[PDB]
């Protein structure tokens, strides 16, 4: 059908008459929600008006395509409150771009990126007192678009819902340090494949990972290292992008991450780390496949400095151990500082919390 | 956690006070629903009691894991009403087995197969007058299990819902004949992969196929032929299993379907066709990979008799054309009768509608 969008200019506001009490000083990820949400409905008449409304349950027809055929996508981004109580979102335009790409892949309706962003801004503004301001804390923003056609046909939905909910989040690390994780690298489990949809933030990519994460824990590891292809390409760690800081086989010190060739989700943090490192101009920055054979050889030769994951949840997450083919591989990230990881963490903290002004931050 | 199940002995019944009018003489697949549904809730206290209740909307928390991370699975099976008004389900035990396998893969709670089946039986019994009895018609039964934890953690759900809804379905073919379809075979699109979850009936497998089906239609084809691997293995057609009746390269007449090696959904119809053909003992019946190279050579040599899909929707669906690498390949299914397809259709019709007694049918 023809494209159309809702407009922020049309936003309707209904304030809660029953606010929840705000948390004390233990923000467990994803279990505590704020007082309001955004909601917009789409059908054959286009989008309705956007509304901010009290946090409340969804009412869905039992045949809703969202629940049968996974016509569902989401985003995640963080807002941060500085010491002056100004709230700012980190590169939210990138998340909007990604959400629209996801929507098109599932034949869900398009909308105007900047109108959604302005609605999100207004929502956060209404719930601004829910954004924590202790060091390292944040507000997680969770936009969702679902198909909502009351039909068991596997087909393009004629109805959809877009909604956004918000969660306060606690700190992951003490100021100025990081704590590493151990990974399970089992080639039997495949997250994504070329020709598939692992490069979109679709619900369907995440459910099948629950059992695998439980196998990692059973095995004494914290997260999953996702391997791909017959050469055991390192793709992602958990729900994070993977980076390696090493001297490569050609003798050149570089930061490498896998290229966007279909099996990598294009992270916002990932893009930001690449951008920052390119701007410093201190070492080579490249997008290239990384194989277990290359890593094993680099480790034995002492060429690896730091391996880490990146994503909205911890920002940068160091790795100290990989369990592969029943071999426990020590990764010397913490013995190398981890200088690069701490550098990234510091620069992101300064930008996100407004210690210095930067074009990446969108004020609320 | 420890396993437990709901019991049919505990079923609660609430009859509708506002029945819907039943359809006239146009049953469009999946859009018309019956007066009641089954519902069972699970949490940390185990399963609640099962209930038959009037058809109504679901009320879900906006953070429900079913909508964010695709913690969702479903089944599909048919009930058939004979000319004596007896209603019978086709091999429903197989669907129960498959549903439990799906549940375990997504870390959703197990339940007792026969208790669910007995509840389903009771539901169909309450809505028995909704089962059509015109030739070729049926009642589709749609069990669903979803995670329902109000949490944005990607984790094993601590709450779930199991529900079943029912749809009357019309006939697909006139009695005693079949109509063929054209397929798009584009190796760029991959349904499933070894190491993945394409062998389970999980919602997440279906949403990404909507865009691909639209590309097939844009290309002048009706359904998608799903190819896998660098040798272009024929895996599935649409949401159906694929069968080929041919003289193989060794000179032997056989019926072949791809083996259950991770990328094939184990269809109930598929299993039934294999069982029937094995019981006749007239030709070789084998599970072997089928490649496009083999098919192309077989076609040019005149060795192909019939290619068809199998599944609960049409039972057997003949193929007459495959568009591959921009070549339109004629498939001579209709020129060969299609004798085998008509044989299968007749034998299934006799069993499903109770013309002859058979252990595959479960009386309601
Ligand atoms: C969300 C996600 C990432 C990280 O994306 P960010 O935008 O940096 O938060 C990486 N990989 C997967 C698989 C993800 O879902
Ligand atoms: C449901 C389905 C089938 C067919 O299964 P039946 O049990 O015969 O209805 C085959 N392939 C896919 C991908 C399916 O979803």
Numbering used by the authors:
A (entry chain A), B (entry chain A): 0 to 24, 27 to 365
Task: List passages from the publication reporting this PDB structure.
BCAT2 is the human mitochondrial enzyme that degrades branched chain amino acids (Val, Ile, Leu) into branched chain α-keto acids (BCKAs). A second product of the reaction is glutamate, which is neurotoxic, allowing tumor expansion in the brain at the expense of normal brain cells. Our first identified potential target for GBM was branched-chain amino acid aminotransferase (BCAT) 2 T186R (UniProt, PDB: BCATM T159R). There are several BCAT2 structures determined, each with two molecules found in an asymmetric unit forming a biological assembly.
